[PDB]
Amino acid sequence: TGCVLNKLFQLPTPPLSRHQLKRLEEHRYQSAGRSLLEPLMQGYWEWLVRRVPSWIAPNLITIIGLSINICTTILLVFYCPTATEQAPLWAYIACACGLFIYQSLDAIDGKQARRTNSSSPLGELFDHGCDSLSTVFVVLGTCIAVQLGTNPDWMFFCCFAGTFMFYCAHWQTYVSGTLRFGIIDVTEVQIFIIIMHLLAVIGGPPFWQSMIPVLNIQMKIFPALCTVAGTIFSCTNYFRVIFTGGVGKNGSTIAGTSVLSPFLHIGSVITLAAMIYKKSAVQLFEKHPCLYILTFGFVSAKITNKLVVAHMTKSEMHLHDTAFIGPALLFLDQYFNSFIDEYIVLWIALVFSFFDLIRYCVSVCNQIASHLHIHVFRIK
Amino acid sequence: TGCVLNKLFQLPTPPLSRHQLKRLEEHRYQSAGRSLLEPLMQGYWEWLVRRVPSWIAPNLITIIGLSINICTTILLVFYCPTATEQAPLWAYIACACGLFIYQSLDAIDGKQARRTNSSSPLGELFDHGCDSLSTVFVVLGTCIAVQLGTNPDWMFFCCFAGTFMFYCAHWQTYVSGTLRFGIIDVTEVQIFIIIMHLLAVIGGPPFWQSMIPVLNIQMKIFPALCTVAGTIFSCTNYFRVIFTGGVGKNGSTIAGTSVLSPFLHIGSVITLAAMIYKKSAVQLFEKHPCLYILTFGFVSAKITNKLVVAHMTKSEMHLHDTAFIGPALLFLDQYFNSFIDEYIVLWIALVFSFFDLIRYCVSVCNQIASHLHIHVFRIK
Ligand SMILES: CCCCCCCC/C=C/CCCCCCCC(=O)O[C@@H](COC(=O)CCCCCCCCCCCCCCC)COP(=O)([O-])OCC[N+](C)(C)C
Ligand SMILES: CCCCCCCC/C=C/CCCCCCCC(=O)O[C@@H](COC(=O)CCCCCCCCCCCCCCC)COP(=O)([O-])OCC[N+](C)(C)C
Ligand SMILES: [Mg+2]
Ligand SMILES: [Mg+2]
Ligand SMILES: [Mg+2]
Ligand SMILES: [Mg+2]
């Protein structure tokens, strides 16, 4: 049983060459910046990390957070598959508490890693790889909490904008070699989403459906407008650095590739999602938005994880990836006038994309661990 | 002017690494077999090659043949763009004479190369690369000569079957390391096509439209049926060797890749052509068959040329290639309910695919020539 499962979760050929592997050992973490709310939260996270026993490995801490976040959001998706129903109030509380636990466990893992001298490139790759999956669930859970499914175009834009900003942060890191935090960053966004779930508990759908008298727009559209405002601010900071901050030869990226090369990958993901949405004869996204977001979210998360790998290995990005097979199944089916029900194809695309993501992640983590002679979830 | 044109016909990165280049020098031509009509034709070709002066380089001989073949077929396409009209009789004669000149010039180039001690890997790569382009024009010219445009499904099958058999011959060479000639091969097929053009001169459309009394099928369908019969025979010889003749480790190909890997490339070409045909709302192939065959013919010829390169460099085949961009343009347009007229897109796809083919061929030939310090069309 263990032999068949192990063969299932690794690709037949190793994804990284030995030369990238050697170059990965030379990586040194560099960040430059400070968010607005981080210094107040620093005292809590410094207190919290001291209470954690020294035998818990970093990669085990992050995955506990993600599992809590996944389970609470999947339960919420189970209650509200079209994002139009009202869930029991405790489900939003569970997501609110789950995200708070996630944020607290995430922010202490690198501090714990330093305290126990277990900082390693596996931990850094695993963290950003875990953050990439969690972000998909955060934007989906938020959209359910605000019932954004009644306005699919706003739901489509906001969910894919959030994944694109998170991708752009790693794109900025791929260009400049340094993770740069803005004035409004992950800390403020996550805290705002936690507070938003409690107003959804207190006021429900009637509160969210009320009209803002001065603008004659529904208040429910305001977080989506906040997402627009956030997108301009976040893109402006990243793109200034994208055009001026290339550390490679002749101002290229650190890998020596064109500064526009990551755009093609995330652009293809967003474009495929937009074509399949606007061409669907059965209005697949409007009837099944959570299932749709999860399908393309796993595709987007993997493409982000390849960018993290491309950063960590100082390698080019190949546009051709198996992650696009799932969207292509949806794409080919809709091309033949939906000969199979797109809902069935979407489930097929979901299951494939999930397993393909898991197969990649397990194979990369095991390969790095075998090279460094460390265990992923246990400190020696 | 020369600098801008030179930048246009080469890719920014060299298509072959130095290690493939070194391995290319170790290649030694091996063939095993004899066609039925070749020994009678051998005396003519041995006589003909002795009349050629020793200063004409091999690669210059092949390209003169191809240019004659291209010009006569393109003129025929110009007179009969839907393959339903009747051309002047001299145009079929010109194609008949042009193909006869082609065959005679092709068959003597390697004999001339041996006589002048100018045999080189550039010549072998250029030859099969030239044969791959010529075959597309031969099947198209044949279909015009027999007016197969009145039965598009037969026209589609026969043209793509011929390209697939030619691909399969190189696939067989990629598997077994040796070019193997059948009892019915290129010599018999080309001579049969030459004779067929003269009956089209003598009898015209009324002859070709006459019914075969015993079968109650039109006689015009018989060459297409001959193409079916030829396909079974040719595939049977190639596929027996494909399953038993792998010289690589554990019976794999000589490059160590799966024996099914070339199938995906030619399969994708044939499948894309079939999807675009059956989905076209304007019946693009039925109104414009020659333009359609030329578009996908250049795509197919390039994919064949990559297989020759993959053979000559002992390398794997990458499925991702720029050759598919042109078909994808047709494919994306038809997906959006033909927002642009597919005929305009087909011209765009033709021009792109032609230039992309020419760019690849010029870049590969110049790269090999620079490494071997030889000139492509001149003997020192
Ligand atoms: C709700 C209000 C709307 C807009 C408000 C303004 C938003 C625009 C502003 C933001 C600009 C900054 C870019 C965004 C974050 C990327 C930063 C990054 O590198 O990732 C981080 C991970 O990320 C996570 O922790 C997971 C993401 C959680 C929420 C999802 C973010 C998408 C935005 C959702 C919004 C739309 C959803 C709403 C639905 C309609 C880096 O992780 P780390 O640094 O290794 O972690 C430990 C270190 N730490 C302590 C420093 C963290
Ligand atoms: C018309 C009757 C229908 C069917 C009849 C039976 C067909 C089935 C049987 C054939 C089985 C054999 C496979 C086919 C040939 C591949 C061999 C190869 O390696 O390529 C050769 C090149 O090829 C050329 O010279 C160009 C091709 C010319 C005609 C196109 C062939 C496609 C079939 C069109 C038919 C459909 C079109 C009709 C439209 C309806 C190798 O070149 P070479 O060896 O380096 O050249 C010099 C050496 N030489 C002297 C040895 C040559
Ligand atoms: Mg963290
Ligand atoms: Mg993190
Ligand atoms: Mg020849
Ligand atoms: Mg030849």
Residue numbers in the entry:
A (entry chain B), B (entry chain A): 28 to 407
Task: Pull text from the paper.
A lipid-like density was unambiguously observed in the structure of CEPT1, of which acyl tails reside in the hydrophobic chamber and the polar head is placed in the catalytic cavity. In addition, Gln217 seems to form a hydrogen bond with the carbonyl oxygen of the sn−1 acyl group. The trimethylammonium group may interact with the carboxyl group of Glu65 electrostatically. Two basic residues, His155 and His197, are close to the glycerol backbone of the endogenous PC molecule in our structure.
CPT1, CEPT1 and EPT1 belong to the CDP-alcohol phosphotransferase (CDP-AP) family, whose members share a common property of catalyzing the transfer of a substituted phosphate group from a CDP-linked donor to an acceptor alcohol. CEPT1 is a dimer with 10 transmembrane segments (TMs) in each protomer. TMs 1-6 constitute a conserved catalytic domain with an interior hydrophobic chamber accommodating a PC-like density.
